[PDB]
């Protein structure tokens, strides 16, 4: 159907069609609020594959996030420590800008659950994302076995605990030798806990 | 639950035999057990493991056949036996699978 065509065309971000549409939409986005409601997904095919459905209780929000690194917020570049910690400028936040987009939209919609998010645009100053949210109080959500899980209280603010797709990526959650540091603190605890058995 | 017998990897342990996770799809096929039915009667299914040799296949197919021959399936509706069930369920008791099908 149309979804395959939208998926393939979305891969062509340098084509004349997508370059033009990106320019006009980025201009339009910069004219409205940093966080604003989207009436519909700008990328319906991308939204579906990330869990979105066109039913009551699913909500799309758009947000722009400042690009670039994290300047150390210390008074006059003064760090009061050893030279290894004197850096102020070329530093980087450990969470993705997409994660920040989810965090801020989740605070903005504190009655909703953040499901997922996707990139839509960027200029030199901002990256634009659309965040998919679900109303756990809506009956259409609570009676739906495919999205029911998110009502349970263990899924409260899953974006704040790195439990969305981008949150687990930023946490380095993965299988095998490349992710041995694993959940870091839990792995660290296992290796730094002295185990003293009853030798009898 | 009954488990397959598999050879451990690496040259340090490939001379041994141990319990594996579950029976392969080919092993269940050759023993006449549908994969959807296998779980309902305590036969684990491992979709990941495969049979690279006839020896692994035959060894585990024999384990399933011995399990099925010792298995008493109760009818879904009590007192109305059906196909694949048993009509002498009176002498049913909790027994160890390792007592019947040990890893040799």
């Amino acid at each position: 159907g149309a979804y395959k065509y939208l998926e393939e065309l979305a891969k062509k971000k340098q084509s004349d069609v997508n370059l033009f549409l990106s320019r006009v939409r980025a201009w339009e986005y910069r004219q409205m609020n940093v966080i604003h409601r989207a009436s519909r997904p700008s990328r319906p095919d991308k939204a579906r594959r990330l869990g979105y459905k066109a039913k009551q209780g699913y909500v799309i929000y758009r947000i722009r996030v400042r690009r670039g690194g994290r300047k150390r917020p210390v008074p006059k570049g003064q760090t009061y420590g050893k030279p290894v910690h004197q850096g102020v400028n070329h530093l980087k936040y450990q969470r993705s800008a997409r994660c920040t987009a989810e965090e801020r939209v989740g605070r903005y919609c504190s009655n909703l659950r953040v499901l997922n998010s996707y990139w839509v645009n960027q200029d030199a100053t901002y990256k634009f994302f659309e965040v998919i949210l679900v109303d756990p109080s809506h009956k259409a959500i609570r009676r739906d076995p495919r999205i029911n899980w998110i009502v349970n209280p263990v899924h409260k603010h899953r974006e704040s605990r790195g439990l969305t797709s981008i949150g687990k990526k930023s946490r380095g959650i993965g299988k095998g030798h490349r992710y041995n540091n694993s959940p870091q603190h839990a792995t660290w605890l296992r290796h730094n806990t002295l185990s003293l058995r009853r030798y009898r | 639950a009954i488990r397959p017998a598999v050879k451990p990897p690496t040259i340090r342990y490939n001379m041994k035999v141990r319990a594996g996770r579950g029976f392969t799809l080919e092993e269940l096929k050759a023993a006449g057990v549908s994969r959807r039915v296998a779980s309902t009667i305590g036969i684990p299914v491992d979709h990941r493991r495969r049979n690279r040799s006839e020896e692994s296949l035959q060894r585990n197919v024999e384990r399933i056949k011995v399990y099925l021959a010792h298995l008493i399936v109760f009818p879904r509706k009590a007192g109305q036996p059906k196909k694949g069930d048993a009509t002498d369920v009176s002498g049913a008791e909790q027994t160890d699978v390792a007592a019947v099908l040990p890893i040799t």
Partner: protein
């Protein structure tokens, strides 16, 4: 108000900003007369309503 300004300057920006052909082929629509004939045929084959 900002929303009115936005939807008006959006039409302007589409007028400048030379449009790629795959987008420019839209805004070339059926004329009024052919459009009426098309809708006359379409209005004959309407889907059945919930009452029907």
């Amino acid at each position: 108000p900002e929303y009115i300004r936005l939807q008006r300057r959006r039409k302007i920006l589409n007028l400048r900003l030379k449009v790629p052909p795959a987008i420019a082929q839209f805004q070339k629509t059926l004329d009024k007369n052919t459009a009426t004939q098309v809708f006359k045929l379409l209005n004959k084959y309407r889907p059945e309503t919930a009452a029907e």
